[PDB]
Design a binder for this molecule. Structure first.
Ligand SMILES: [C]C(=O)[N][C]1[C](O[C]2O[C]([C][O])[C]([O])[C]([O])[C]2[O])[C]([O])[C]([C][O])O2[C]1O2[C][C]([N])C([O])=O
Ligand SMILES: [C]C(=O)[N][C]1[C](O[C]2O[C]([C][O])[C]([O])[C]([O])[C]2[O])[C]([O])[C]([C][O])O2[C]1O2[C][C]([N])C([O])=O
Ligand SMILES: [C]C(=O)[N][C]1[C](O[C]2O[C]([C][O])[C]([O])[C]([O])[C]2[O])[C]([O])[C]([C][O])O2[C]1O2[C][C]([N])C([O])=O
Ligand SMILES: [C]C(=O)[N][C]1[C](O[C]2O[C]([C][O])[C]([O])[C]([O])[C]2[O])[C]([O])[C]([C][O])O2[C]1O2[C][C]([N])C([O])=O
Ligand SMILES: CC(=O)N[C@@H]1[C@@H](O)[C@H](O)[C@@H](CO)O[C@@H]1O
Ligand SMILES: CC(=O)N[C@@H]1[C@@H](O)[C@H](O)[C@@H](CO)O[C@@H]1O
Ligand SMILES: CC(=O)N[C@@H]1[C@@H](O)[C@H](O)[C@@H](CO)O[C@@H]1O
Ligand SMILES: CC(=O)N[C@@H]1[C@@H](O)[C@H](O)[C@@H](CO)O[C@@H]1O
Lengths: 142, 142, 142, 142
């Protein structure tokens, strides 16, 4: 069993991102999302799957999907923003198992990733515990 | 804009179903899930999309996916249980736009549905508000 | 350290009780409330304190407070309903350390308790794990 | 009826503050706490009462209580930190109706307030809507 525990940080009172969606990819017997002590906890049965969280700021017409998983026994993460209305977490999560650019992001097995949207706001994932079954990450909204 | 506000009722202290997943299908400009006053609220850009909630009772090895949406300007609902490990809400939600028996449940535009798992536990959805932009449903776990 | 983990069951689709308040008494170095995998978890520093949860059904103008704690190394529980508007969980929780009938309920160290409100609705607390540091209870709304 | 809707911003990936308590003072027909679209909403029957939230960062031994209310038809707010183990939100909330320095903080009817703990971390409340029945505020953890 792997877990990925996620702490969400929102660094500026400009806009407000709320949680709107959480998905589980079907590989390795799937997975679950849990709220545990104010954290998002992704539990997976083995290596080779993932889960996504979508956040939306309606004040500023902004959004992003953050995906976390384990690929060949190492954690990975990715952020996708500049989402169309058709790009829900359900769509984005699935794409990490067929779309080349998404595949590569997952294949990179990164301990940290950051990206800016069209408005120049940065989003980041940083794993604070990068090894073992029980992984920890910060999700940082700039 | 459509909303569907869901009240969850767990009726018997045998096992414990917890929320593990919430998805949004991509049609009609997507949609979102919100927690509002102890209720799950699905917001949708217009007619023709849906969202799924998955619940798991790990005590008793039981689970189900409940799906809610609007089809041709009327509400619909369905429950799927006896899930394989591969059947997350991500997977199930999509099947309502291609798989014939799932297509049928959507086309049925039901105000009320119920089914049972192989263990004999019943799951039900009853809309209490069936018309208009702001719909309401009970999700009853037996 | 004691923990009491609480599963809430709402048994009838008549009215809807939503969580509105969660308090901690000051004795034994206090304590915290956490949400953990869909359950309410009361964590306390040692024996001799407690915490309260209030639920409101504004549809039917019903409310109650359920209090959980440890007194002389045994778990206890109680429910107060037919609440005035001035009887928040903040108020009720404190009454268990000065008000004689509340004191008595705490001193009973019950593994289960049930009571009916003005409208004949039954509320129940039933501990499923009655011994040790990590206690479990069902909160059942009839 | 007054509402105060609160958006929480945790700005710094050092330590993690989780919600552990939410209370309602008994005056003016009391009040309730709701989770609404990822925000904390305090509802109160009229002017002259309040509610408190407590947040704890176990990793760094930090905590605080943030209190919001309406005093003589104008909003107020306060933060207390450097807490003892006996100072739960239950205790702090009610000190605003008896303890002079706390009474004064409330009598100030502030639209913004900030204070630091002994470790130098700033906490802040910033009302973004300051007038009328439905007030809005940012809670910023530095
Ligand atoms: C070990 C790992 O991680 N692997 C991976 C995978 O996962 C998998 O899947 C399968 C189906 O296919 C099953 O489910 C199992 O259980 C799991 O584990 C996948 O995910 C992939 C992506 O696609 O990746 C990885 O691997 C690699 C190899 N080479 C293959 O391809 O298989
Ligand atoms: C009106 C309605 O409801 N419709 C529907 C639909 O939805 C749609 O989709 C599209 C794509 O394709 C888009 O997205 C839009 O926006 C929406 O709205 C669909 O869903 C279907 C299912 O498949 O169903 C319904 O319909 C039928 C017909 N075609 C019509 O349209 O009417
Ligand atoms: C051990 C026990 O449980 N005890 C109890 C108590 O608690 C206490 O408190 C105190 C203050 O005062 C402190 O905080 C400590 O820490 C604790 O532990 C109390 O609560 C009481 C009630 O009031 O009860 C019990 O007890 C015993 C005797 N009997 C007396 O009373 O004291
Ligand atoms: C209007 C206002 O805000 N006022 C106030 C108050 O509140 C009140 O309280 C009472 C009892 O006593 C009752 O509950 C009612 O309902 C309410 O409204 C209080 O809070 C106070 C503080 O302590 O403050 C205010 O005021 C002033 C003086 N004290 C008088 O006026 O009385
Ligand atoms: C700005 C943006 O969202 N770009 C994303 C990038 O972050 C992600 O790594 C890549 C692979 O999924 O797909 C997009 O190009
Ligand atoms: C036992 C079970 O899960 N049955 C489901 C049924 O409830 C649902 O209406 C149908 C269409 O999606 O798919 C399955 O037959
Ligand atoms: C109907 C009702 O709520 N009665 C309660 C009772 O359940 C509780 O055990 C006792 C001590 O606190 O007093 C209260 O009034
Ligand atoms: C560091 C600290 O917690 N100081 C608080 C202050 O913020 C508050 O305004 C006052 C009134 O309650 O009580 C204390 O002095």
């Amino acid at each position: 069993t792997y877990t990925i525990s996620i702490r969400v940080y929102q660094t500026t009172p400009k806009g407000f991102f709320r949680p709107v969606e959480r998905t589980n990819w079907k590989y390795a017997n799937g997975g679950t999302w849990d709220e545990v002590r104010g954290e998002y906890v992704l539990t997976m049965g083995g290596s080779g799957t993932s889960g996504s969280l979508r956040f939306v700021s309606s004040d500023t017409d902004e959004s992003f999907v953050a995906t976390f998983g384990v690929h060949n026994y190492k954690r990975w993460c990715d952020i996708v923003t500049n989402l169309t209305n058709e790009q829900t977490a359900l769509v984005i999560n699935q794409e990490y198992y067929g779309v080349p650019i998404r595949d590569q992001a997952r294949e990179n097995q990164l301990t940290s990733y950051n990206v800016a949207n069209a408005k120049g706001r940065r989003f980041a994932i940083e794993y604070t515990v990068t090894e073992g079954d029980n992984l920890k990450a910060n999700l940082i909204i700039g």
